[PDB]
What we know:
Order of helices and strands of chain B: EEHEEHHHH
Shape of chain C: elongated
Radius of gyration of chain B: 25 Å
Order of helices and strands of chain C: HHHHHHHEEEH
Family (chain A): Belongs to the TRAFAC class translation factor GTPase superfamily. Bms1-like GTPase family. BMS1 subfamily.
Largest sheet of chain C: 3 strands, antiparallel
Region (G4) (chain A): 53-56
Subcellular location (chain A): Cytoplasm; Nucleus, Nucleolus
Strand order of the largest sheet of chain C: 2-1-3
Radius of gyration of chain C: 22 Å
Strand content of chain C: under 5%
Number of strands of chain C: 3
Helix content of chain B: 25-40%
Number of strands of chain B: 4
Shape of chain B: elongated
Protein name (chain A): Ribosome biogenesis protein BMS1
Region (G3) (chain A): 1-3
Helix content of chain C: 40-55%
Largest sheet of chain B: 4 strands, antiparallel
Strand content of chain B: 25-35%
Distance between the termini of chain C: 70 Å
Oligomer: part of a larger assembly
Strand order of the largest sheet of chain B: 1-2-4-3
CATH architecture of chain B: 2-Layer Sandwich
Amino acid sequence: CPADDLNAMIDIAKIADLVLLLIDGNFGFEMETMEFLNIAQHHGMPRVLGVATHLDLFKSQSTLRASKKRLKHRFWTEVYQGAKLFYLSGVINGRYPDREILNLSRFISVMKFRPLKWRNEHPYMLADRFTDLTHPELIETQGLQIDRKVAIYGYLHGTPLPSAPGTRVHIAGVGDFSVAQIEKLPDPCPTPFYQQKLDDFERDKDKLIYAPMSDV
Amino acid sequence: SDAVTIRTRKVISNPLLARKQFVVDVLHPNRANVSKDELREKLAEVYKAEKDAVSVFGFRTQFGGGKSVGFGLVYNSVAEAKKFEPTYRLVRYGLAEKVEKASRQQRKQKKNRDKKIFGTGKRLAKKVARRNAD
Amino acid sequence: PRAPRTYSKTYSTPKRPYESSRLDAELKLAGEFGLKNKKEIYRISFQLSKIRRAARDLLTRDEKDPKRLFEGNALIRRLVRVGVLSEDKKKLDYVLALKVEDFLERRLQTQVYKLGLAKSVHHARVLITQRHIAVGKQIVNIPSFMVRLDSEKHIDFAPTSPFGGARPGRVARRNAARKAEASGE
Amino acid sequence: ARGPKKHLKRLAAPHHWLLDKLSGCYAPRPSAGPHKLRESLPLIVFLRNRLKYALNGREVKAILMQRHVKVDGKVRTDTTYPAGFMDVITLDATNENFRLVYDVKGRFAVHRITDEEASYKLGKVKKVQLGKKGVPYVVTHDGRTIRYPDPNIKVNDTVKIDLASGKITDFIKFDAGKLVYVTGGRNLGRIGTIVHKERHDGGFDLVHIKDSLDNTFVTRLNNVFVIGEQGKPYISLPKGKGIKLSIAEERDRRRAQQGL
RNA sequence: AUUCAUAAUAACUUUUCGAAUCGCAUGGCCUUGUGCUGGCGAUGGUUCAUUCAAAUUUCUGCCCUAUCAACUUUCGAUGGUAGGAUAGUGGCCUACCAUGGUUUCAACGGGUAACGGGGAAUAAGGGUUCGAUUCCGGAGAGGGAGCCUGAGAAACGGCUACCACAUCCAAGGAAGGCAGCAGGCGCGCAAAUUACCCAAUCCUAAUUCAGGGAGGUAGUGACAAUAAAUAACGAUACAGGGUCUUGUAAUUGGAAUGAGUACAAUGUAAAUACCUUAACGAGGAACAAUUGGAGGGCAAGUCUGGUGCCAGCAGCC
RNA sequence: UAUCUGGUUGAUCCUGCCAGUAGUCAUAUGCUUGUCUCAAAGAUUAAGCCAUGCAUGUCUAAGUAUAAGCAAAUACAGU
């Protein structure tokens, strides 16, 4: 999440299915956390999982335990009571200790989600990469300012968005358009079970990461 | 911190472990506490004790301060003071070095890994080396 | 997988809580003796009811019964040592006629107020609570101490507790520092 | 339940050990030996709870493995060795001896004895049979089997086994008028004289015992340990001599000894 | 109380036992030979006794149901005989022979959200209800069934097969059992740490030494329970009771102290925390207490304003 | 010592029910939750299903040491 902006923050709270909400332990709760929690509560609450960082800055165990209890009870006020949150110790090698990260991975590898009302009728889409498709001669000849044809890639969630061209589309923070064309590219990061199913139709050792938005 | 009074009551002589056992109580009307190394030094100079053969280990300060009651004991001929004392109290007095091991999870995991081989395992090592090398 | 430790309730909420007679009676009790709330009165009433049940069970027993003699002598000696029963009232007919005001009088709050140096039961309560009382030579800060009869004459200020000398407290040091750094120069 | 039990929890230990119910959830559980485990005493309880010569269990083990503690003249290195009645537990580091006898309150008492009289021990002979090759033998209350006894030594009597190799010394017959210790029931620790033996065929004979204050009681036959003639016990009795005063005069004696 | 203990005669046996073991000591004798003899132990071994146990076992005592009155007895049900098997008694099983055994004092069948007891609560007493659960006994290790080893298991952190689930892969095969400690799923509506240690209590072994999620320590939703802070003493002006006793105040004066922070020391296996303490830490004590209710019943409002309607008076107050 | 008051009546009395106040080793839930001591915690519905880690191993002077193991009595002798 871009922390300073509220706009994409609201879009994230509208879209996300699991939200890892992180709080500085030594500082306390901040206004961004409260604003995101209220936006998520009003727009349809997703699965919220709290994590607290900067806990090695505490110099005494008594203050650390009391602050952990206070943060946990404030979280239990904002979220359902008994909700468990994770305590992260240090950043000693640019990353967190292995046990806490293991428990974070284990909790979200067995959890199930709730059917929200808004997600189950309106189709939505998370865009993973971006490409502008215009001819460079069209860019050069008529002054670089004519509005463009843009093809964007991503994953569909919620509802089937019909295969007829011209269905109306809203892009949050941009506006309202009508889509010219759509197609289904093959999935670039398939599950392994999909790969044994494919191999069974004819009868990915390291590419578990698909990040076209960033560089390798 | 004006003065400290050191009184050893209930003294029982134990020739079974070759020591003397007692309940110390200290009147320390001002300072903070007992300062157990300093208290050990003065209890050593009390009898004739050769300080490393003196062990005071139980202590509790009475509510309101000033009075602190604990249990301690003094050996003789410090060789069996090293023989008969527990290891943690020997380390606490500087008479031993704290040994470094792995945690219990790592030790138990190492034991369970070594449980899965029969013999020294050099045969299996050479077999898997020649199998996965070629 | 261990031995259970014993515990008991020390009070009992009345079945008829807000009837006016017991309400203003316990209001008078908590006002004259400076009690914090109504659990003090209920606790003292629970102790009085236990003593009354013991005295009734002993008085139903026959005279010169060794059980009656032993437990009656023990109970009367205990209440004399506490300070409730008078020295000329060592009979079971008189412990069946006891009252909660005898137990409320015996507590440390009143017993430091009645000896002077406190000037009100609430100043006595605050003085005890703020870690000042020295019973014998031991610092007491519990207002329901129930002072023993033999220990009634040893109540004084601590070797700590700056009203008994020994380096006056923090706000006096604050005032001295302010008068030294600002009023001094 | 599928085999023998090796643990004994606190609240299941015998009450006469005086083990506090806090500070641990397990009891010593004395091993197999000469005495029944509910009428015996482990060496750890004697060296720690009674004598207070040790502070932990490993200190008791360090005492025992140093070959200091001897039961009936023999070195024992067992932490939970079941010492019981009439044992001659002795310590040579302190040059100090004990005889395990019951206090009048119903528990084993600390009864220091001299160097002499720590060289013999009374044992209630409990069965007299005939062994292999026609050799008569007796066995007593602590499993001591003695070959070739006196022909007048009958069942349910006492014998004087010294320390070394059995070799029964002078014995006394079970009869009316003898001095008797009570080693069971609610009359535990009381000493008296037999006045009648109410014999019952089928089982469970009864003994009527009158103490030195002429306050009689009755007990079963198997809780009777004859320990000498009237006015002369064959050992040194503990403090109080087994009188069982009621709580009133015990309290009065406590205030009599109270002060200065 | 015995055909008991034990002894004796005759024989018998795929026939047992009666030390071919280990450590630490270097003594004594002379025929002066690595001669003779000899100490303290460790471990095995036959039987008896003992101890830790186990298996059967006598008497009496369990909730509801008659819209359950007859039940067992083919294919053992009651008993006698002989045998097999058992560690041993025994219809435990087998061959034979009798026809028995239980019951209106309730046999038998059925239900039980029925493990039993010590115990818990409500009572003045009798009763009534609860007891999965810190101790004792029993049973089980997803459901039947069988077995090896061993003194002891019909053992499941042992084995074999069947039933139901279910893991791996190269498709040939291998492997499984959290009603142990953590932890997860079982609804999309939720509840302790996949932490530290054998220091204490004890248990195991060849064994002072190793091991122990048994157990202890700390963490975690106010289970339940104990004690207890959030203020105390004044001066001034009004209101009083009226010259000595109180309330009110965007009035004021100094004392006292811990909730927290923290050198130190104690504590502890190492810690956290408690107890102790140099220093910091209070006027809006902002270092900021809550949950309900108000004619009654078993307490505290004959308090205030606003709203919907009226074919009631006036007509927009 | 042992907590009841009304309605069901115009009164007098059974019988059940309702409204109210109070006590709860009773279940569930809400709000609030500074200190000390203490100690309960997947039975209630499912003896339903389980990822991963651990939970049973053990050596004395005294059973077997030629480790081409480690340091320093030509039969071995420490660990």
